[PDB]
Every structure is written in C-alpha cells, then in structure tokens.
Amino acid sequence: QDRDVQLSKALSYALRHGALKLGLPMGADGFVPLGTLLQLPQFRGFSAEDVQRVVDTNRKQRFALQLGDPSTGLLIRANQGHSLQVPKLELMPLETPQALPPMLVHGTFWKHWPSILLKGLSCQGRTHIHLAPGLPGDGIISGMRSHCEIAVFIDGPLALADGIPFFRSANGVILTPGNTDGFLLPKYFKEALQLRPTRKPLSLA
Ligand SMILES: Nc1ncnc2c1ncn2[C@@H]1O[C@H](COP(=O)(O)OP(=O)(O)OC[C@H]2O[C@H](OP(=O)(O)O)[C@H](O)[C@@H]2O)[C@@H](O)[C@H]1O
C-alpha cells in the first residue's frame, strides 16, 4: 500500500518536474507514454494496473490517463503542478472576472506567513501559484493541502485588472503565474483566516 504512496510520489515528480532530465519523451501538453516511464529505474517495479489503481483512487485527480494508440500505449500526465514547460497543457483560461470561481483561497503554514506578508505568494519552483475555488469540509478540496494552518483569500478581479492571468486545471485547481518574478503581491490579498487549531481572522497590511 505504501508502495502506492511511493508510486504517486515517483509519478508526481517525474510527470511534474523530472522527465526531460530522465529521458522520457513528453510532449508540449505534458503527456508521456506510460510504458516508457514504467521502464525507468524507479518505475521498473510497478505494473500498469498499479499505476491504474493510483490514477483512479486518487482523491485530488493529480493524474490524467488517455488511451493513446497500441504503438504507444496509454498516455499519462499530471493535471497541474509542473516545473516543466508544457505550453499545450489542458488549462481553462479564466480571462474575465465573471469566469472566476466563487472564492480564491491559498492555504499555507505559519513558517512561511512572514515571507508571504512581505513578498507575496510565490510560484516557488512550479510555474503557477495554486489556489482552491473554495474551503473544505470537516474536506480534501483540490488545489489546497490537507494540514494547512492559515488560509489567505485573493482578490481575483483586481489581479485580472492588473493583467495577472488565471487558469483552471482539469481537476479543479486555479493557477496563476503571478507577476514577472512569480509573486502574487500582498495588494491582491483580500482576507486571511487561521484554520487550526481554531478559526480566527488574521491581520494584514
Ligand atoms: N513568498 C513566499 N515565501 C515563503 N513561502 C512561500 C511564499 N509563497 C508561497 N510560499 C509557500 O511555499 C510553498 C510553495 O511551494 P509548493 O507550490 O510546492 O506548495 P503548494 O501547497 O502550493 O503545492 C501546490 C500543489 O501541489 C500539491 O498537490 P499534490 O497533492 O502534492 O499533488 C498541493 O496539495 C497543492 O495542491 C507553500 O507553502 C507556500 O505557501
């Protein structure tokens, strides 16, 4: 079972970040033949049904699978979170404020809170900042981690008014490249909320 946890992690890294360094033949849409991946050293211990299990029982739908042809087999991608340049990846462009989700919200942790207040939310390594289109139940909402302590909400219409684009992934995640350096500046911060161990509001600028 942990092997499924290990399979997902190895799948996440290879499909999101390390593929052109691993030799895999990935297209500009982020799709790679699954067999060529399962031929890699770290993947040689897994079966196409193991990967199939991880793809369907995954609650965040991190990976998409496509039939392909028999000469290539199944095509497998990650839906979001890429360090690689995949310009043709399936993304819904949220170009007007009326297409945006009800609320944009990023959940993070105290260790990073002072840097976010002073520099803004950063893409960090990834190509897009990851936001949720809502808060979760007592919930696994995709686009947000599970053990977050504080959540900060984003003013979507104001960011768009300043030419900061937004995108929706095929698994419900909202993405933005930020500004030039990959930062969502603290001006587009509308509201903040501490989540654990008690729901309390947090102050900003
Ligand atoms: N200026 C700043 N200074 C200091 N820290 C800053 C900062 N700006 C942001 N940070 C924080 O630095 C980390 C970012 O780095 P990351 O992108 O890898 O973290 P994330 O949570 O966004 O992860 C994305 C998806 O990836 C996973 O999806 P999976 O389930 O693994 O498939 C997740 O669940 C998500 O859905 C976060 O803590 C940021 O708050």
The per-residue DSSP string of 67-82 comes to: EEETTTEEEEEESS--
Q: What phi and psi, each to the nearest 5 degrees, are found at residue 111?
A: -55, -30
Q: Is the CB of 128 under 6 A from ligand 1?
A: no
CB 25 within 8 A of CB 32: yes
Q: Is the CB of 121 under 6 A from ligand 1?
A: yes
CB 183 within 8 A of CB 175: no
What residues form DSSP beta bridges with 121?
A: 184
CB 120 within 8 A of CB 204: no
> What does the block give as tokens for 145?
């981690």
Q: Is the CB of 108 under 6 A from ligand 1?
A: yes
- The secondary element (H helix, E strand) that includes residue 201 is strand 200-201
Q: Which residues contact 205 (CB under 8 A, 6 or more apart)?
A: 117, 186, 189
| Nearest residue by C-alpha to atom 6 in ligand 1 | 112
Q: Is the CB of 62 under 6 A from ligand 1?
A: yes
Closest ligand 1 atom to Cα of 122: 8
Nearest CA among 97, 112, 125 for reference residue 188: 97
Q: What is the resolution of this structure in A?
A: 2.5
Q: At what angle do helices 48-57 and 2-16 cross, to 10 degrees?
A: 90
Instruction: Give the span between the Cα atoms of 37 and 83, in whole angstroms.
Output: 18
Q: Is the CB of 124 under 6 A from ligand 1?
A: yes
- C-alpha of residue 149 to centroid of ligand 1, in Å: 13
**Domains parsed from the chain with CATH numbers:** 2-78 (1.10.10.970), 91-201 (3.20.170.30)
Burial of 177 by CB count in 10 Å (0-12 exposed, 13-18 middle, 19+ buried)? middle
Closest ligand 1 atom to Cα of 119: 1
Method for structure elucidation: X-ray
- C-alpha of residue 69 to centroid of ligand 1, in Å: 35
Longest dimension (CA), the chain: 57
- C-alpha of residue 151 to centroid of ligand 1, in Å: 12
| Nearest residue by C-alpha to atom 27 in ligand 1 | 145
